[PDB]
Amino acid sequence: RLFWLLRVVTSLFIGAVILAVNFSSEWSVGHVNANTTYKAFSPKWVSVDVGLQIGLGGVNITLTGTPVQQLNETINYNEAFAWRLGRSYAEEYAKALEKGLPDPVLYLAEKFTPRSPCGLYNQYRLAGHYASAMLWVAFLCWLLANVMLSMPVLVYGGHMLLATGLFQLLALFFFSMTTSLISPCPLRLGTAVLHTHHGPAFWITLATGLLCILLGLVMAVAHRMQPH
Amino acid sequence: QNSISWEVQRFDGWYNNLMEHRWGSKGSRLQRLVPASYADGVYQPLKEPYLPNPRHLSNRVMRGSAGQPSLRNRTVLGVFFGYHVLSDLVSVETPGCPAEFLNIYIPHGDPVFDPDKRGNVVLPFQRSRWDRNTGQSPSNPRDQSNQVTGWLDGSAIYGSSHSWSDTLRSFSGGQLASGPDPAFPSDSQSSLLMWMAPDPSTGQGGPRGVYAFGAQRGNREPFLQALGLLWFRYHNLCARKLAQEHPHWGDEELFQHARKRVIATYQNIAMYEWLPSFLKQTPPEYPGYRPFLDPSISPEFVVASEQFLSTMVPSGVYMRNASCHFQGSGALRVCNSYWSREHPKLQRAEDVDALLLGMASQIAEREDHVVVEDMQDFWPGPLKFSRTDYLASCLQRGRDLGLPSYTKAREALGLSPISHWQDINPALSRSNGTVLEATAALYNQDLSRLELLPGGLLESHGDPGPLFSTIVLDQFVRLRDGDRYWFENTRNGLFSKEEIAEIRNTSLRDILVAVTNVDPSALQPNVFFWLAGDPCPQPSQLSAKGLPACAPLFIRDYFEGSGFGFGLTIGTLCCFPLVSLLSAWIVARLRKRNHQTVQQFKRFIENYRRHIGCVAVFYTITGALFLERAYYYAFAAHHSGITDTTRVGIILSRGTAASISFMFSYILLTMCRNLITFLRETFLNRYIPFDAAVDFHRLIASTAIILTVLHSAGHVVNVYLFSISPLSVLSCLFPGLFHDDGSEFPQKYYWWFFQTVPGLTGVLLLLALAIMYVFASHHFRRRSFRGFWLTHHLYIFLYILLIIHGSFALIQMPRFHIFFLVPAIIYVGDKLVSLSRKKVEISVVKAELLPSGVTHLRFQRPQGFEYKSGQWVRIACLALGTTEYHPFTLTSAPHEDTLSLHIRAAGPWTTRLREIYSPPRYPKLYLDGPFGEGHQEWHKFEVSVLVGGGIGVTPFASILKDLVFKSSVSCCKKIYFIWVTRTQRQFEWLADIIREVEENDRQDLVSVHIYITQLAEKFDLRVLNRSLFTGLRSITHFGRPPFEPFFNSLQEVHPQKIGVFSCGPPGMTKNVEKACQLINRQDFSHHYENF
């Protein structure tokens, strides 16, 4: 039975990775440890580590200090600003600007607002909307390929296993057109820069898509040359 | 952690005062000295039936010569430094929008904007931004909002946000981003940031030559550019001076150390050198920081400073160098220089070096009502025109913002009130006072109607009038007594106690001498005044005599060259069916290469009580889904944004976009064969007819295409009306897709069609439909079953383009998946159930050709094949055509070896099948097993009465043969077979099956009766106790089946409840049930059947 367990666990991993990647905010990940101003009404500079995470539906600015007790305080922030078709980014930024978040968090939150010189809103709101529907299509295809892993002829299941990885790669391609404009947009925090590059949830999807394409090609070759 | 030992000043203006943060920020709302004076009281402005026509008030008073000197000798550098300060403070000019206009009606015969006496010509004008939380009731009327930090914090040099001060910075030391010339900012990042309007004198409107400044519109003249450049170069100079005494400072400890010094010098100048000259009285003093004074910019301040400064802007400005040479006629005019891209004179640093020294030595115009032509008749128009009246737009804006009258706003400021017109300006009434009467005749001699601007311009004799002066003064005192970062405040720790006594001693000459690198004796100590001893005497007052002429008006015409292209694109959109029809003709030709009418209507309504119900319910559902969105987009008008531009082109689209998203989605419940095969045997076939699925399928496909043609002919009109609307309306209809800079030129039609996801996917869908519908018609399905079956699989492409199509936020949210989830699920399930089982391949044994169309096929019985009497199968011949399956009712008993199928000729596939097997039996078929419950319910009654009629008598041959076999062999009693018909035309094989049945029935278990039911319109159709014609002993009565007397007398011939199973048309299937019920109140299941 050692083969059937693997044949089930592989499909389970594919489905779980589609579901997890479609909701994980680690597509583009940047990080830096700089000296920045803390907040208003205080000339005191703190030493923190600022990093953002773009996840097809919003960002996560995380400003935490090198120590977690800097100025009779404790600095561990993790705020989210969502631009997906449900919520609004402008209202979230305008409601966070009243609460008095630390200055670099508001800085990095401003960059993605609508009608900003950099313009990182109308190219991210479309990527996180197309590369996120081409991960639901690549899940419907996975369900159908699992249903065709039974009494129905298995060559159609193999074709749908091709389609799963094909749609995964077609989704991963749409989050590649959002690197030509995030690189020009400067993110100079104090005296340090904050570079963003494709994160884990962009490589794991590539690996899963390649695995699905290879499995499909092998199934096609097998059922075309040796019906075993 | 570094050398920045203070609080870095925010760019957006927030968090400036402790208690309330919002006060001076990027989007605060303007307070009011006097409550709103709107028409109703909420948001409607006064108009022309109440107050005079703007263009008619801007010709009677504010028009005159352009050769009058100022009274205080105010040089023309102060006139253009005020335009910079008041761009630092307030900006209420950007049109905010749920797109709403109030236009300027030009009178008849205006020598400029209406020279051909051409009746009425309109001059557009759009309302400015407003606060979304205000404008709902007379308790909080509409309040505008300024788009620049309301503090004097150099928000015109460094931009008014943090994502704006980063694009115009270089991070090379502390230096704003220069260009190829170290004294000119970068024209490269000029596109996303700045305001780019077309030069009205030439027409060019590109981002090449538009510098990058802090004010969004600092290029409105080469004379505001010439001060933006001064402050830019001064910042660079002081920062590269800092970088040479503290070399170990980064690229931030230099920017934030030059920024505060530039800001402090700017504040010192704009407060203690410009203001004591604009209004000729020094500000009182600096008391300590007052954390409670409300520093909010009011509209009355806008009108009192920014729109009053225009009374002394001259016609042309000089240009001199450091030794009084006024050539470089030699004075560039103003009406041609608006939004100048690349001026031939001002191309190098030594040209602005000269423009500034020429502005600092020219005496501006006089401060009175008279405004020059270069703004009154030649101000760059915002839309639809080239030129536009300035003052006739300042009046429309003073009416838009809800400014008070001139007496209300004068008695609400503590000033003494005026009684009549003759005492508005007691000095103007002593010499040429005809202007006071000429403006009185405009208001019907009603003094308490004067707008804020005309009154103030009429009152200002040599200085700003007693009204504007107090507004400007108290506003500029609340702007420093409520500013925390005011350089003189010794509590924010910005400056030391001495570094203030060196910023309070920095005039504007000590900046021109520093930047322009000139000697200190080439200018005067007070740049804002020329007082008869200062160097470079002005040659002569610059009238408009000896200057170039002003470029004339030209109306901008959207949709100008792209009319033939639009027509041709629509024509090609129309000839999708024609190209597909010609291609289909080619494919076919090359595949060849190898009082009784009331009774008729009663019979109609009797047979079709089940088709009308379904058709009416489906069409009612579709009509409801249409009217919902139609009534919505007609009488809701969410934000009234798009409902005002396109009224019909959006209803005709949003209704037929919800109707077709339902039709194209529920057209799949028809071709789910394995569900109908089950349902048609339940109690449902008495309500909805399942044997008309395919007819219903063709009927739902023929309606969706009409609705789609409407849905496309609506969006053609939408795309046309979206190709002539200004950018300042498309930036409000479709935010995120458009952005409102001054270009005002929207995308062409082909951008809408072939460069947008909905448009391109819609063109592809039109092509796919024009292929599928034409190739799947009757004339291209009878001619070839392979063209049909090949093209018709495009519905997958169709259903991918339909999910890609609405996936965009133009008008609403996508809604197709809601309609498409369940039907696609059911269809794919019943397609998997079809693909699961196997299709055996049988060989025809003997298929002889019977007359009248029926074809008695015979073929062997596979080993794993067992069926009950009455179950149908599905066959597909591959000798011609495709894998098209067709159902057929078995007409053979289960006990005999090979099973048969009598196939009646009923169309293309069946005529082909008859043509193939003509004159045999060679080819093969694809059997698909039995299909049905196969009820044997007549084996539990003592007697049964089968009543089959019309087409539904096909499944009775096998039933009769099986009954007689089980009767004779197995050793139920007296089962009757009353079969009624109309003609007995195609069911002649049954007339011989009945003979072969009666011959094999020795126990007399089957009795048969026939009824013909025709009236004299017949062919006439038609010994040993039989009939010589057919040879069967069963009287075939030519009347009409008597049911009630039959079952009535049946109870007498034998005392036995007996089944009344019946199949056929509803007109008989219900009549037999009625006849059964008419006797049940006595000593009769009447159980329907459907095989």
Ligand SMILES: *[C@@H]1O[C@H](CO)[C@@H](O[C@@H]2O[C@H](CO)[C@@H](O[C@@H]3O[C@H](CO[C@H]4O[C@H](CO)[C@@H](O)[C@H](O[C@H]5O[C@H](CO)[C@@H](O)[C@H](O)[C@@H]5O)[C@@H]4O)[C@@H](O)[C@H](O)[C@@H]3O)[C@H](O)[C@H]2NC(C)=O)[C@H](O)[C@H]1NC(C)=O
């Ligand atoms: C992306 O961001 C979202 C939103 O944050 C994440 O979703 C939230 O996840 C947390 C995880 O526990 C859930 O639980 C909440 O956690 C809150 C953490 O509190 C921090 O932030 C507060 C305000 O943002 C802040 O006040 C607080 O202390 C700070 O302020 C004090 C007073 O000013 C000061 O004295 C302190 O020194 C300190 O500076 C923390 O910094 C917690 O406050 C809540 O009570 C709650 O338990 C949230 O519920 C989640 N959000 C929602 C809407 O449910 C998401 O996980 C992020 N993405 C990823 C991948 O992690």
Ligand SMILES: Cc1cc2nc3c(=O)[nH]c(=O)nc-3n(C[C@H](O)[C@H](O)[C@H](O)COP(=O)(O)OP(=O)(O)OC[C@H]3O[C@@H](n4cnc5c(N)ncnc54)[C@H](O)[C@@H]3O)c2cc1C
């Ligand atoms: C002896 C005999 C027994 C039959 N028994 C049955 C039966 O038990 N159950 C049954 O449903 N049909 C039955 N049929 C109908 C049979 O499908 C038609 O005779 C045949 O489909 C004609 O095909 P065509 O190429 O002429 O189609 P067309 O002339 O295009 O079709 C004419 C009519 O046939 C119907 N039709 C077409 N294709 C199908 C299909 N795949 N399934 C159902 N209806 C279709 C259409 O709705 C239309 O009203 C029987 C026909 C014959 C001749």
Ligand code: HEB
């Ligand atoms: C939407 C989509 C669609 C459309 C539009 C259409 C349109 C149409 N159509 Fe259809 N169909 C269809 C979808 C469709 N369709 C389907 C899905 C089917 C089935 C297929 C299978 O089953 O495979 C059909 C099928 C079909 C058929 C056959 C069936 C059998 O045989 O079984 C026919 C005849 C038809 C016709 C038609 C016509 C005539 C038209 C036009 C008018 N179609």
Ligand code: HEB
């Ligand atoms: C199929 C058929 C069809 C066709 C052919 C078309 C064609 C078309 N189209 Fe259409 N549409 C449609 C179907 C259609 N369509 C639909 C169904 C819709 C809806 C979607 C949803 O609802 O989601 C639309 C929608 C739509 C829209 C909206 C979008 C959104 O909302 O998102 C638009 C704009 C359009 C356009 C168009 C055009 C331009 C065309 C061409 C001309 N469209």
Ligand SMILES: CCCCCCCCCCCC(=O)OC[C@H](COP(=O)(O)OCC[N+](C)(C)C)OC(=O)CCCCCCCCCCC
């Ligand atoms: C989930 C699977 C569902 C399958 C489909 C079930 C429902 C099918 C119903 C449609 C069938 C069909 O339109 O057929 C088309 C039919 C032809 O019918 P036929 O087959 O020749 O009749 C067989 C006849 N016998 C049974 C006697 C043999 O012409 C008609 O209708 C004529 C009636 C027109 C009704 C007009 C209604 C007006 C509404 C006005 C609204 C404002």
Ligand SMILES: *[C@@H]1O[C@H](CO)[C@@H](O)[C@H](O)[C@H]1NC(C)=O
């Ligand atoms: C941040 O500040 C600490 C404080 O001492 C300093 O040691 C460190 O060098 C600074 N880092 C940078 C990158 O300026």
Ligand SMILES: *[C@@H]1O[C@H](CO)[C@@H](O)[C@H](O)[C@H]1NC(C)=O
């Ligand atoms: C100023 O302009 C005059 C006029 O052409 C020219 O001769 C002189 O060289 C210029 N520069 C000076 C005086 O520095």
Ligand SMILES: *[C@@H]1O[C@H](CO)[C@@H](O)[C@H](O)[C@H]1NC(C)=O
């Ligand atoms: C300081 O005093 C006055 C104030 O403007 C000024 O005229 C004088 O030149 C200044 N002294 C300098 C700059 O040495």
Ligand SMILES: *[C@@H]1O[C@H](CO)[C@@H](O)[C@H](O)[C@H]1NC(C)=O
């Ligand atoms: C204004 O400038 C002119 C130019 O010559 C001069 O004659 C006049 O005296 C100046 N005004 C005053 C008040 O000095």
Ligand SMILES: [Ca+2]
């Ligand atoms: Ca400002």
